[PDB]
Design a protein around this ligand. Structure first.
Ligand SMILES: O=c1ccn([C@@H]2O[C@H](COP(=O)(O)OP(=O)(O)O[C@H]3O[C@H](CO)[C@@H](O)[C@H](O)[C@H]3O)[C@@H](O)[C@H]2O)c(=O)[nH]1
Ligand SMILES: *[C@@H]1O[C@H](CO)[C@@H](O[C@@H]2O[C@H](CO)[C@@H](O)[C@H](O)[C@H]2NC(C)=O)[C@H](O)[C@H]1NC(C)=O
Ligand SMILES: [Ca+2]
Length: 286
């Protein structure tokens, strides 16, 4: 209850780098705000954001009625670094959950910058984790034509998981109090440091690490409805989706903005609403 007052009832963090992902990140935030009356605070990994995004965020905050905080955490020199920017961004999603946020924040949800929310995110805040420090949705099996690309259903992963789900990292709820109690952050950092000695390991860093650790750092498998991606999930389950991820389709290679406009009817309305807000701020400041 002290976390709800000092911060907000719903706390979401995301990571974005590049104009395309920042444009989608504003849309993700507008989609959250249109679907809840609970208080919201957005948390941003500052060093990857553009100066324009950081200058526009107080205008988004005042227009949509949310609070926000910029977090700048320095990668520890002992911890194996990532030379690829994409892999460093993935490290920021999963390696520092216990230290990016203040001790007074009890719970935080990661929501991908390219996501569209169609639900009250307070329902995820209230989802029962039963002592798991975090919850992720599983990868869908419902789009049968994509079975050849489900790498987690054959080879190394099928033998390692033994039927346990392979989870997607586009969305996850973190009970920070339980995550801290279980020292999950220190354990993920130490395991990542040891596993990353092999440069071929953790190809999908943010996703492979929690899935590899799920027999010792439990994952509360979220209802499949919490994350729908066309690449893996059936058309028929879209009407039940609480959130949508615009995940890459290895078969079609369709561009990101084309996937957004084709799959999500309300995407253009959020995009035009934020562009109208940008034009209004441009005249008021210039
Ligand atoms: O120039 C770029 C490219 C990517 N990203 C971020 O990198 C991640 C992955 O990019 P994305 O376009 O979302 O790829 P997807 O196919 O959507 O990725 C899926 O699979 C990844 C793991 O393989 C997870 O990190 C994603 O959350 C999940 O949506 C996301 O957090 C993006 O915000 C950037 O910020 N800038
Ligand atoms: C947030 O509050 C608004 C009211 O300010 C809610 O809007 C109503 O939603 C119902 C949905 O059954 C509509 O039938 C009404 O016409 C809406 N009324 C108004 C005045 O907008 C909205 O549903 C609330 N959202 C959530 C998720 O609680
Ligand atoms: Ca994504």
């Amino acid at each position: 209850s002290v976390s709800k007052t000092e911060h907000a009832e719903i706390n979401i963090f995301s990571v974005a780098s590049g104009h395309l992902y920042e444009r989608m990140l504003n849309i993700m935030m507008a989609s959250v705000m249109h679907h809840t009356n609970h208080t919201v605070k957005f948390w941003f990994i500052e060093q990857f954001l553009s100066p324009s995004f950081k200058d526009f965020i107080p205008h988004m905050a005042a227009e949509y009625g949310f609070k926000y905080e910029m977090v700048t955490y320095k990668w520890p020199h002992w911890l194996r670094q990532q030379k690829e920017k994409q892999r460093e961004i993935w490290g920021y999603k999963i390696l520092f959950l216990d230290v990016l946020f203040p001790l007074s924040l009890d719970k935080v949800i990661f929501v991908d910058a390219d996501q569209i929310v169609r639900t009250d995110m307070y329902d995820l805040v209230e989802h029962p984790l039963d002592g798991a420090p975090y919850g992720f949705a599983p990868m869908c099996d419902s789009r049968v034509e994509m079975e050849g690309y489900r790498f987690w259903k054959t080879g190394y992963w099928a033998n390692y998981l033994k039927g346990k789900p392979y989870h997607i990292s586009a969305l996850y709820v973190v009970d920070l109090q339980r995550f801290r109690e279980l020292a999950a952050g220190d354990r993920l950092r130490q395991q990542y440091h040891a596993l990353s000695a092999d440069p071929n390991s953790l190809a999908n860093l943010d996703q492979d690490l929690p899935n590899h650790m799920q027999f010792t750092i439990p994952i509360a498998t979220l209802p499949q409805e919490w994350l729908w991606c066309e690449t893996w999930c059936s058309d028929e389950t879209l009407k039940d989706a609480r959130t949508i991820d615009l995940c890459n389709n290895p078969m079609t290679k369709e561009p990101k903005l084309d996937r957004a406009r084709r799959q999500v009817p309300e995407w253009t309305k959020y995009d035009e609403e934020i562009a109208e807000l940008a034009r209004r701020v441009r005249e008021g400041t210039k």
